[PDB]
Amino acid sequence: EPITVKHALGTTVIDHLPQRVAVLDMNEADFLDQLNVPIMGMPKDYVPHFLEKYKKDAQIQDLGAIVQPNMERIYALKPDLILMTPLHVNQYQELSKIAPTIHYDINFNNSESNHIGLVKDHMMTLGKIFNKEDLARQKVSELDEQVKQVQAVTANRPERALVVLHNNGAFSNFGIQSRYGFIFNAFGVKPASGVVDHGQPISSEFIKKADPDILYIVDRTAVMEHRPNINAASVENPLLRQTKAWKNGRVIFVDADAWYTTAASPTSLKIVMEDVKKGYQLEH
Numbered sequence: 001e002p003i004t005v006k007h008a009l010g011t012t013v014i015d016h017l018p019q020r021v022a023v024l025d026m027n028e029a030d031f032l033d034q035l036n037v038p039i040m041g042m043p044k045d046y047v048p049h050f051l052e053k054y055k056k057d058a059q060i061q062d063l064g065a066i067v068q069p070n071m072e073r074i075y076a077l078k079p080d081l082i083l084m085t086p087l088h089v090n091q092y093q094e095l096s097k098i099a100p101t102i103h104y105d106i107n108f109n110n111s112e113s114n115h116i117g118l119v120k121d122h123m124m125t126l127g128k129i130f131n132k133e134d135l136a137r138q139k140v141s142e143l144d145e146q147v148k149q150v151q152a153v154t155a156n157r158p159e160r161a162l163v164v165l166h167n168n169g170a171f172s173n174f175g176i177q178s179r180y181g182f183i184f185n186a187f188g189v190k191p192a193s194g195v196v197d198h199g200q201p202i203s204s205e206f207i208k209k210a211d212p213d214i215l216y217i218v219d220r221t222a223v224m225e226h227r228p229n230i231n232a233a234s235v236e237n238p239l240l241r242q243t244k245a246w247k248n249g250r251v252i253f254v255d256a257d258a259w260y261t262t263a264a265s266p267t268s269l270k271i272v273m274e275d276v277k278k279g280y281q282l283e284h
């Protein structure tokens with residue numbers, strides 16, 4: 001019963017159970033970890049904390065950088081399956097030369113529609129390929145329950161939120177049509193701005209007209225420069241500090257590994273939803 005995967009970049013047929021798997025980003029690595037599927041190679045420049053055991057495991061080949069893994073190292077690893085994503089589209093043809101190559105059908109650029117369904121679909125596809133259908137279906141059920149939990153928290157709440165990305169002292173807003181669109185669409189968070197605009201840098205005019213009751217701050221610099229996450233005392237930005245969210249203590253410094261490095265896999269979405277719920281939590 002060979003599986004045929006018709007994805008965004010072509011069609012991949014898998015006739016045998018793959019045994020030497022290369023994953024090209026950390027979302028994919030989280031899927032296979034969650035399915036208890038061994039990984040033969042992955043990039044290791046930005047391994048999230050919840051995949052820490054993989055950075056240290058010398059039996060897992062380091063393929064280099066997430067954004068552009070080392071094609072020479074991949075070819076040498078002789079994988080029998082490569083998992084890649086929209087980040088690697090420019091390498092798909094070259095990867096498919098080396099091994100059957102699956103593309104994760106997901107939209108990292110604009111997640112406003114069906115983000116959760118696309119994550120679930122991928123999980124079920126991987127469960128079929130690796131003969132882990134029952135465990136795949138369980139993880140899908142868990143994701144569904146988690147989504148119901150955050151939707152129960154956001155339901156009928158009046159608060160409106162911004163998702164803002166910190167980068168080297170600069171802050172930019174990510175709205176309903178951005179990479180964080182799914183926060184609004186999937187989980188029922190109400191956006192503090194609706195106007196469609198890298199993100200929109202925080203200006204005085206913007207924050208005046210889109211003054212959030214809740215603020216989720218994604219610290220990109222903590223990930224990229226491997227530095228600790230900023231906290232309330234790091235924030236110099238006066239526009240952010242005069243918002244209702246800041247005054248009322250509804251500022252969540254999110255788990256940047258789950259929100260920035262991944263954001264499209266079972267462990268990461270679980271964490272994202274816990275962070276979202278903290279934004280609504282009025283008491284300890």
Ligand SMILES: C[C@@H]1ON(CCc2c[nH]cn2)C(=O)[C@H]1NC(=O)c1cccc(O)c1O
Nearest residue numbers: 066067086087088108109165179198199220
């Ligand atoms: C349209 C851009 O092009 N690509 C392909 C090349 C790339 C960018 N970042 C990692 N690989 C994106 O993934 C898109 N990236 C973003 O929109 C983006 C937004 C906020 C922070 C980032 O690091 C982004 O890449």
Ligand SMILES: C[C@@H]1ON(CCc2c[nH]cn2)C(=O)[C@H]1NC(=O)c1cccc(O)c1O
Nearest residue numbers: 025026046066067087108223224260261262
């Ligand atoms: C740590 C990040 O993890 N992943 C997945 C999340 C992501 C970031 N940008 C697009 N997708 C990366 O592509 C890694 N990004 C970068 O190394 C990066 C470098 C220069 C400019 C960018 O926009 C980058 O994302």
Ligand SMILES: [Fe+3]
Nearest residue numbers: 067087108260
């Ligand atoms: Fe990027």
